[PDB]
Amino acid sequence: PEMVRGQVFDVGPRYTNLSYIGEGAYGMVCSAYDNLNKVRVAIKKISPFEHQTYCQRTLREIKILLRFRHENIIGINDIIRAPTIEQMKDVYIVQDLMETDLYKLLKTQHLSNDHICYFLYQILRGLKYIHSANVLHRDLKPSNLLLNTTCDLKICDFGLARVADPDHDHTGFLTEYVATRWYRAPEIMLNSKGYTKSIDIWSVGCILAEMLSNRPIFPGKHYLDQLNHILGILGSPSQEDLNCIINLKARNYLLSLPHKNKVPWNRLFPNADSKALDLLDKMLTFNPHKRIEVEQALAHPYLEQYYDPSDEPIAEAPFKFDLPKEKLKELIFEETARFQ
Numbered sequence: 001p002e003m004v005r006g007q008v009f010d011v012g013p014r015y016t017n018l019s020y021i022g023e024g025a026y027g028m029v030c031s032a033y034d035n036l037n038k039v040r041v042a043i044k045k046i047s048p049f050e051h052q053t054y055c056q057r058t059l060r061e062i063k064i065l066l067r068f069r070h071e072n073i074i075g076i077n078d079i080i081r082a083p084t085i086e087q088m089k090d091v092y093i094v095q096d097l098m099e100t101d102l103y104k105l106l107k108t109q110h111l112s113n114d115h116i117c118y119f120l121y122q123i124l125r126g127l128k129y130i131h132s133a134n135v136l137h138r139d140l141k142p143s144n145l146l147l148n149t150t151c152d153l154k155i156c157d158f159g160l161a162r163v164a165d166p167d168h169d170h171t172g173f174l175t176e177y178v179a180t181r182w183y184r185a186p187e188i189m190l191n192s193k194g195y196t197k198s199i200d201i202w203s204v205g206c207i208l209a210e211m212l213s214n215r216p217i218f219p220g221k222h223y224l225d226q227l228n229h230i231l232g233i234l235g236s237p238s239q240e241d242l243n244c245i246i247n248l249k250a251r252n253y254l255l256s257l258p259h260k261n262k263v264p265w266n267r268l269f270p271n272a273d274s275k276a277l278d279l280l281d282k283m284l285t286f287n288p289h290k291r292i293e294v295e296q297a298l299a300h301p302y303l304e305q306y307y308d309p310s311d312e313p314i315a316e317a318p319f320k321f322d323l324p325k326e327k328l329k330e331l332i333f334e335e336t337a338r339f340q
């Protein structure tokens with residue numbers, strides 16, 4: 001069996017001529033020739049079975065992506081693994097080959113306003129479908145937005161996704177760890193478990209800001225620093241917004257801070273389209289109840305050239321609503337059976 005800059009890709013006779021793309025903590029991504037469909041594809045090797053949390057992330061990714069079907073969400077074309085649980089040590093997820101991702105692209109490329117608009121439209125179109133399935137992505141960031149050579153955008157990595165649960169969203173101060181730090185909404189550090197759809201809209205707002213300047217807007221240097229950066233730009237929350245935080249430790253932390261003025265978006269981004277900045281402000285709104293929702297964002301004047309609700313589909317069957325790793329391996333084996 002073929003081996004790439006590390007170890008073997010047991011991707012059988014169907015996929016050949018492998019080429020390394022990138023790596024991970026328990027996986028490697030290669031491109032490969034699909035001898036059946038006569039096109040090169042991406043293949044992600046995943047080896048998660050020794051750790052319960054790895055099994056959790058892998059099962060979520062597989063289960064969600066197999067149920068979703070949307071132009072702005074990466075699909076799973078094939079899954080390769082051993083014919084028996086006993087022999088299954090790795091799982092290979094086969095996907096359309098994408099040229100780059102938004103993280104790699106922003107490292108060297110300035111985006112025209114037309115590309116910012118197009119990318120943002122596609123992100124929100126995909127997000128509308130995800131949210132319509134009652135699912136939260138919970139880790140939206142540039143590296144989880146794939147792009148092919150014609151700038152078709154596909155959301156990927158649902159390993160941290162959850163079913164929305166707003167009735168159980170409240171928690172205490174400085175406990176929660178949702179999303180990647182730079183894309184984490186202020187309430188995560190204050191009183192939220194990240195179980196409502198507003199968590200994803202905040203991340204999209206951070207991504208829009210980053211598209212406007214090729215720098216993260218809130219580059220917290222560690223978990224505690226992140227709120228400093230958010231409040232340094234948004235300014236002090238209003239009395240009404242504080243009155244919405246019943247938790248006393250969270251509210252009193254904010255009350256302990258000196259008054260900070262808002263930094264205007266047009267001083268941070270003087271070349272940006274004014275409609276883009278208006279939408280940015282509504283996504284990066286401190287109060288998660290006042291934060292714009294995905295269908296409102298699609299209808300915003302900035303996106304008027306693309307907005308078409310009849311071409312912004314929703315999921316047929318939403319998701320309506322602990323396990324040892326051995327049960328999780330069983331479920332992964334069951335979930336991947338359709339490809340044998």
Ligand SMILES: C#CCNC[C@H]1O[C@@H](n2cnc3c(N)ncnc32)[C@H](O)[C@@H]1O
Pocket residue numbers: 021022023024029042074095096097098099100101146
């Ligand atoms: C997480 C993680 C590791 N990703 C490593 C590399 O895989 C790349 N990747 C993941 N899926 C695809 C993909 N479907 N096509 C091309 N590259 C992909 C991603 O851009 C990154 O360079």
